[PDB]
Amino acid sequence: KGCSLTKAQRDSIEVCLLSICGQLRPSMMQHLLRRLVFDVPLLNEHAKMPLKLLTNHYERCWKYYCLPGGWGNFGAASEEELHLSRKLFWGIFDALSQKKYEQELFKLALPCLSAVAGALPPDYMESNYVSMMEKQSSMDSEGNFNPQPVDTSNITIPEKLEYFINKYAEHSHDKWSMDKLANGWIYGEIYSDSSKVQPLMKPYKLLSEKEKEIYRWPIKESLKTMLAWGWRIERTREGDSMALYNGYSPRAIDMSNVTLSRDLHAMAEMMAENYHNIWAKKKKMELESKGGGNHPLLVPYDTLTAKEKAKDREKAQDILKFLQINGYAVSRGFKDLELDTPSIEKRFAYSFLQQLIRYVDEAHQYILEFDGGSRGKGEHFPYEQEIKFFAKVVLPLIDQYFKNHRLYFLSAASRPLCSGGHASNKEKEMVTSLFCKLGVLVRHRISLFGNDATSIVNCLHILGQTLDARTVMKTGLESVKSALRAFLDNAAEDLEKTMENLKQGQFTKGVTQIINYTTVALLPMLSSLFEHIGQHQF
Amino acid sequence: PCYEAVLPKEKLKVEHSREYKQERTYTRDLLGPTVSLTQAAFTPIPVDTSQIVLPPHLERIREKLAENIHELWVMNKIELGWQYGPVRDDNKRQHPCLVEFSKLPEQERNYNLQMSLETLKTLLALGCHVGISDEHAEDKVKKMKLPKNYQLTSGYKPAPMDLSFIKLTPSQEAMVDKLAENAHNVWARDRIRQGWTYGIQQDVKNRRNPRLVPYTLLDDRTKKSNKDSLREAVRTLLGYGYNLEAPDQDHAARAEVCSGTGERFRIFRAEKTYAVKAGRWYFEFETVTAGDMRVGWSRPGCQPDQELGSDERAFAFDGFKAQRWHQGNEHYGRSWQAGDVVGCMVDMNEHTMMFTLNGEILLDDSGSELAFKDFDVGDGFIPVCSLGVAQVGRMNFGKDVSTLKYFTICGLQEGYEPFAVNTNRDITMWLSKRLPQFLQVPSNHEHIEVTRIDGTIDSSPCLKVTQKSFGSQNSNTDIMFYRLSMPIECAEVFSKRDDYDFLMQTSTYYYSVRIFPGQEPANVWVGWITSDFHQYDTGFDLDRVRTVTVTLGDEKGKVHESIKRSNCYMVCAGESMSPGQGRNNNGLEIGCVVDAASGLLTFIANGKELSTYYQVEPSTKLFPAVFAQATSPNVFQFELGRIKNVMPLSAGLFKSEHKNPVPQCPPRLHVQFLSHVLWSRMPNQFLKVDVSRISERQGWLVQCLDPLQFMSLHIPEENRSVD
Numbered sequence A: 001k002g003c004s005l006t007k008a009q010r011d012s013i014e015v016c017l018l019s020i021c022g023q024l025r026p027s028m029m030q031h032l033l034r035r036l037v038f039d040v041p042l043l044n045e046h047a048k049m050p051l052k053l054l055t056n057h058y059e060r061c062w063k064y065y066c067l068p069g070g071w072g073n074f075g076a077a078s079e080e081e082l083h084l085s086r087k088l089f090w091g092i093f094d095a096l097s098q099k100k101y102e103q104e105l106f107k108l109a110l111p112c113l114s115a116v117a118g119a120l121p122p123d124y125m126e127s128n129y130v131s132m133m134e135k136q137s138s139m140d141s142e143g144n145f146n147p148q149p150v151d152t153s154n155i156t157i158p159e160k161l162e163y164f165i166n167k168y169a170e171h172s173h174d175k176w177s178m179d180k181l182a183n184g185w186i187y188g189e190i191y192s193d194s195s196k197v198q199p200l201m202k203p204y205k206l207l208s209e210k211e212k213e214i215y216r217w218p219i220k221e222s223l224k225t226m227l228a229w230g231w232r233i234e235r236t237r238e239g240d241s242m243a244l245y246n247g248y249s250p251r252a253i254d255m256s257n258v259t260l261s262r263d264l265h266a267m268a269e270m271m272a273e274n275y276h277n278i279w280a281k282k283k284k285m286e287l288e289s290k291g292g293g294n295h296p297l298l299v300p301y302d303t304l305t306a307k308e309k310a311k312d313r314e315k316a317q318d319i320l321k322f323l324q325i326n327g328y329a330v331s332r333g334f335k336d337l338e339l340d341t342p343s344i345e346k347r348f349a350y351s352f353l354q355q356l357i358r359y360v361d362e363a364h365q366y367i368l369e370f371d372g373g374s375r376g377k378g379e380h381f382p383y384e385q386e387i388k389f390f391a392k393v394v395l396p397l398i399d400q401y402f403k404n405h406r407l408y409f410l411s412a413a414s415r416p417l418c419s420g421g422h423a424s425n426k427e428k429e430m431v432t433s434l435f436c437k438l439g440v441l442v443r444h445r446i447s448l449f450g451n452d453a454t455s456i457v458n459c460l461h462i463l464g465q466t467l468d469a470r471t472v473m474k475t476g477l478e479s480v481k482s483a484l485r486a487f488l489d490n491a492a493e494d495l496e497k498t499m500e501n502l503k504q505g506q507f508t509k510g511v512t513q514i515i516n517y518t519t520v521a522l523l524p525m526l527s528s529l530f531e532h533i534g535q536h537q538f
Numbered sequence B: 001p002c003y004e005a006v007l008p009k010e011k012l013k014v015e016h017s018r019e020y021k022q023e024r025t026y027t028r029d030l031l032g033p034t035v036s037l038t039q040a041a042f043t044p045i046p047v048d049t050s051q052i053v054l055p056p057h058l059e060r061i062r063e064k065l066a067e068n069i070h071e072l073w074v075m076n077k078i079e080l081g082w083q084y085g086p087v088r089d090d091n092k093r094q095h096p097c098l099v100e101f102s103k104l105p106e107q108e109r110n111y112n113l114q115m116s117l118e119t120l121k122t123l124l125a126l127g128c129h130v131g132i133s134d135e136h137a138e139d140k141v142k143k144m145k146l147p148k149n150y151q152l153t154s155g156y157k158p159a160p161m162d163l164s165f166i167k168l169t170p171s172q173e174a175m176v177d178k179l180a181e182n183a184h185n186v187w188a189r190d191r192i193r194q195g196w197t198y199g200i201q202q203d204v205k206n207r208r209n210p211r212l213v214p215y216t217l218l219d220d221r222t223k224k225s226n227k228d229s230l231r232e233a234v235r236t237l238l239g240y241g242y243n244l245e246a247p248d249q250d251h252a253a254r255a256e257v258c259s260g261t262g263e264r265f266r267i268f269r270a271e272k273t274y275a276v277k278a279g280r281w282y283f284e285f286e287t288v289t290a291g292d293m294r295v296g297w298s299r300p301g302c303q304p305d306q307e308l309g310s311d312e313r314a315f316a317f318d319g320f321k322a323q324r325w326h327q328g329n330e331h332y333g334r335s336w337q338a339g340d341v342v343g344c345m346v347d348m349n350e351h352t353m354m355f356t357l358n359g360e361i362l363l364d365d366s367g368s369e370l371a372f373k374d375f376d377v378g379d380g381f382i383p384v385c386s387l388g389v390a391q392v393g394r395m396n397f398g399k400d401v402s403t404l405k406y407f408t409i410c411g412l413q414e415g416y417e418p419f420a421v422n423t424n425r426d427i428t429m430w431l432s433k434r435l436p437q438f439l440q441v442p443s444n445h446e447h448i449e450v451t452r453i454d455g456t457i458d459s460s461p462c463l464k465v466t467q468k469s470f471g472s473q474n475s476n477t478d479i480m481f482y483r484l485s486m487p488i489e490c491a492e493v494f495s496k497r498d499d500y501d502f503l504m505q506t507s508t509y510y511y512s513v514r515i516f517p518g519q520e521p522a523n524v525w526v527g528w529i530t531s532d533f534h535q536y537d538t539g540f541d542l543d544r545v546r547t548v549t550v551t552l553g554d555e556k557g558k559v560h561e562s563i564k565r566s567n568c569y570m571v572c573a574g575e576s577m578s579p580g581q582g583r584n585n586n587g588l589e590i591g592c593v594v595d596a597a598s599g600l601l602t603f604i605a606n607g608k609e610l611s612t613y614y615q616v617e618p619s620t621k622l623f624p625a626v627f628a629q630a631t632s633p634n635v636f637q638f639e640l641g642r643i644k645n646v647m648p649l650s651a652g653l654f655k656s657e658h659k660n661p662v663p664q665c666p667p668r669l670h671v672q673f674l675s676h677v678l679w680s681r682m683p684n685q686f687l688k689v690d691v692s693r694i695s696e697r698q699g700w701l702v703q704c705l706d707p708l709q710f711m712s713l714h715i716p717e718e719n720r721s722v723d
């Protein structure tokens, strides 16, 4: 993303990153994907390399995202990868839609978008749950780090936590004293740093009252930033047992040896980025106070290296471990109220295909306006960019999506693909409506097509032999049935009039254009329809 | 009597307790793990519906719904000839509930109303949502006429609008049928609450029921009873227009979780000495049932616990997925149906293997017929197969060439020889052992590590258990069972600075176990076990230990003595802790003392004598043992020290050190752990036993008349015996 790079330097970086990311584990790059989902939709000259890298990733690891199990060794999706991939796909799709047509940019973007579409499962439920403190503000384009501190001074702690930090204050003073012992300080009456004599050999019952507050207040802010995210923390009988049992040499209960659960390891590391970002906030403020000497460690925590990050993992781990040592409980900030799985709209393919419905109906209205303006000599319309986008991406993307997901649309959870792949009946019938409506759009319009009619016919006939006609005439919306029957009947009289004109004239202007459309498209189209009908017994 | 415990259509037979019997080796039916027989106990499980709240349109539909439907059921009974009368007796064709709901007992009327409520609420609880198609449907009142004579005494005409108009879709029909299943389950709940269990016939004297049986096994006539009530209820409910919308029906796969213990498969193979090192060989495998079976060639080092093809030991072929198996899974061949033969071929000299299926040679994804291209000779190859849950298979080693049927069409002309081409004696075949045994912890074992700590002048000799793979991924946490190799022998006849004389004449022995800090002790159990202990469970508790109480009584019946027998005598450290979290200061020290003269097993923890104590029979071999679940890299440690006035465990264990107060840990003593990686040898010849029904008067006859013998090798220290 740096700008001063030369062309050769840029190319070297591109090829290096391409090779590395291509040969890396699929799970590793989701961290970078989290920045790619935010940087790609700008689609500047810089986003080209992200487009290649996304293409290669999804072409490599489509089977991982497509199969619920994926590769057995690689694992399976985490569904936040699915959410970010959905957002990436929709952002590229819509942004490319509203930007103007550049031939090279569009040819390069097509494989990427059409590969994300193939990788994403069609039936993908939208995750009704959302994230916390999305850090796209932190990974700001200018400054490269905005260490925003989450506000926490609104919540207060109860008397249970009062006793908790009291006992942890004894406990932290205990490590104070054992660090003292391991360092070499000794008991005396005078204060000298070299002599290794601290003025604090007097016990806890007399211990100074300022000295916990430097443990209390930071840890207080720590527990309140826990409780700000939604923790409802309670206590068990272990603390009651402690109370019942009821400058000095302590002993430390070994404490790293106990291993922690997966979700709370993630919990500690996320609270760790929150508190490391607060630390980097004060450090950055100190940096503008100085006005120079940029601190090298001001880089995002996702970009920090592990050795220096141990500096806050040790406190995260030990503070949580002593949290259930003093017998409290951990709670997730929120639990989902309801999952809206009945919604067929919750499927990825549903929202996607209705977006196709709106875009193709837009194309229908345009081609109507282009037919009304085709009686004018110059078809200089503002919608040429829209039709170029359509016939160059969306219809080729339709081709890609269906030739990636043949089985899902053809399977209705009948018996093929015992893993699943159910395309619902109404989803199927509206897909058939899209097919017939595309056919209506493309009929007798080859000449206006800038040689794109070839690709149009390719997508048309592959859709012709990839249908669910049996399902549609056993179940469907009868208005959709009427539309498809009207399309097939319009084609029916087209065949008759093309018998006529070709028999009165053995050799082949609107009638010339439409008979050319016939002789070059309907014969493959009729072959595809009849062969599909005769192979699936429709 | 035991004859009436048989399931109704099931037929009583007397069969072998174990799977296998005496028959020809090629006709032998190898059996995989059986499915767990959880269906033996018929426990009704009606779904609770108290949480279900009825929609307002259903409260203000179901009163007249209920009244119409009981008027219809009294129509359904007057169809059979059922008449009203003052007397309650059903036999005399008279019954005072045939009258209108007001006149009939309001208690039975209310039971009918709330069972209609239960039906609707249970439809709601099954996800069977209900949506009225149109309110005009219940605005309009269509009601078929009924003559007075065909009708009841009341003038009400129960016949609703003509029911032939409405039809119920198959999925709705299915859910409603299993709703009726839930209804009969509620009836069974009531019967069990009454005290009324399954039998063969109506015995008010014995007070059992015959008809208590699962619905899939339910009797026909009552089957049609619930069918007719079902028909009536759903037909009326649809007639009132209250259309019910089916909940989504998604496929679910259980894939045979029900099985005996955790065994997923059983591995069958020949003897290691029969390994082939050169030449070409052929054998056959007949699949009686289609299933998750694997057949092929394995190396002598194949582990009975791991699945075939996962490691480098074995080469196998899978049917259903059509997958070759060696160091991974790749696509090959097709799936087999029941009765298919899949016999294998191997060419050792050019190092190739091929497969067939009913004669035709299976091909790769490519055109290559070669199942596995090239491989090293190694130490040899030996036939092997894997049988899954509820799977039956047969192996033919070609002792008789005529029994190999597809060999002639394919395999013979190429030159392959039968595996048992030239053998006068039958092949000894080895299978995976089902019952785990205690064996020495391997050094290569990556999960369990044992350190021997020499005892200094101030420290007792110690054995400490460590997990090397703790904290790493792919590591599965499961309870491990550990014991000490040498047992303590109790006295044969029970008698009914320390003191040197007392320590010399005493027979009490002591060992202690330290649970290292970080290993929470509720997962740690300490005590003694006997040689009979062979139970492997992922979840172990002191309640489920096997025990029996033999009571020997005098002539009139008084129990003059009673004995407790159990293989496990163990205590938990979690309960042993008196102070909660008071153990994290230093590792807790369980101590066990055994008095061989009196057979008293008492435990001392942290200097206090725990209340739990055991009494064992004379001459009982007790193995020191510790069961623990790992929560830390360091789990626990054995300590062989001696407490005041007690003889260390070395004196009890070793005879040559009987009178040596100094604790010792000789190299013979070692820590063993329970494991499943062991083979078993199937006997070449079995006992000939014939069983048959002589008559009803004479019963089933069992007869064994010819003797067989085997010489058993007995390991003294382990109290074991093997052929």
Ligand SMILES: Nc1ncnc2c1ncn2[C@@H]1O[C@H](COP(=O)(O)OP(=O)(O)OP(=O)(O)O)[C@@H](O)[C@H]1O
Residues within 6 Å of the ligand: B097, B108, B109, B111, B112, B187
């Ligand atoms: N609560 C009730 N309200 C109205 N009629 C009832 C009621 N219970 C039983 N009857 C009548 O008695 C008949 C017998 O019903 P029921 O099935 O309860 O009989 P049972 O001999 O107790 O046997 P079981 O319940 O085990 O099948 C019913 O068909 C019905 O005519």
